[PDB]
Amino acid sequence: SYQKLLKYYVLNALKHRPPKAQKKRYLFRSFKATKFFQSTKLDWVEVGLQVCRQGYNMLNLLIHRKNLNYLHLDYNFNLKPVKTLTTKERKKSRFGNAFHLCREVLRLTKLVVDSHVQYRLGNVDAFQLADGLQYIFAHVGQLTGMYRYKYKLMRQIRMCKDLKHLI
């Protein structure tokens, strides 16, 4: 694990190049001049629940855009068919890997947010919350099926495995 971490650091140090000069970039300053967006101040856990329910609503809209009735997405982001499929229904269920990749990213985000929701209800201790957040970022590959969707993501897991050992 020492040799692999030092290998990735040598690769990041060797492939370093200065970024290209450009005009300075501000997305939300362009969003603010649009009258369709407003601003407020909220708590972190409230917006963390709003983000995951909005992601559920977005994936549900992307399912029900193509008039699909035989698929079901759980609130914890698991997609399952309701019946045994046919030839044409599998042709009408051809989404990209980006769909399931964003699905697993929202699944990871919902795990991370609900770990705090379980804490602020008084159920677990902060000493146990710090363990729980440490298990998630170490075991993304075991808690999610996101490794099947991007293969280069195998680099990201083993590094989190290697930092798992040393510490």
Add this chain to the structure above:
Amino acid sequence: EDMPPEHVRKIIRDHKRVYLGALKYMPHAVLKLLENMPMPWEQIRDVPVLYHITGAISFVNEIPWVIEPVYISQWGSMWIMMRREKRDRFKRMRFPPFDDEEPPLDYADNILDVEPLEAIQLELDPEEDAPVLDWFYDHQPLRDSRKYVNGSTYQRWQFTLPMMSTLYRLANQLLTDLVDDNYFYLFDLKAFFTSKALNMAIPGGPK
């Protein structure tokens, strides 16, 4: 200017060319949510939120700026406290707790009036830790003081020397006891690049 939280709460609670285009930037909102996760010594954290008129998307709109020696000292304090807690005390949390068929929990009815528990804090003895006692566990410490931080944008910092001595004493676990570069001999970046170019392996080095 800003807007009270009850409006956007009602927006998210009760709820198409204008609606469909706003969902393009959803993983950007995921990134802005995940980079601002609260520290183990904080209980709550307030963030600004941009939102659509119909509740399409919600961003966090803030970059998590910290002062680096304060940050290392706070994590070293957490390191010592968690070592003390494991040698003293264990139930790992049951993963995903909320079931597949139930919706995510409403904030306004279940967390909004419930007071949170205690966080993870070190004791900070008031005699030796006197330069750091008034600000060591804030969200953005010394933000409203003109003598240390330049202003509200929270960009530059300058401290005094007993403050740096105390923050260096508290962070003694996350730091090394090295004094000079006689260490890392044949074990630095240039020796690793030379072993890369010659296709040989240093004992202990990468392959």
Add this chain to the structure above:
Amino acid sequence: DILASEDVEGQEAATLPSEGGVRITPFNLQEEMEEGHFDADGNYFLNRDAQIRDSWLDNI
């Protein structure tokens, strides 16, 4: 050369899809002629146009 649906001598109906959790093969060569085709000697060739490759759809 290719085999037609008349050179099968005894296809039947496709009554039930599954029972007991075990998928039932519909006893006819319709879906195999949809996916691929046969030669005169009975070998099978499969079409290979699956561009998106849909890594969840392959193993449901």
Add this chain to the structure above:
Amino acid sequence: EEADAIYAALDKRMDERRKERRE
């Protein structure tokens, strides 16, 4: 019609960051 023009103007503003260099 106006809302798509607003999103197209914001996309053209995003493309303005590299407009004279890319084309």
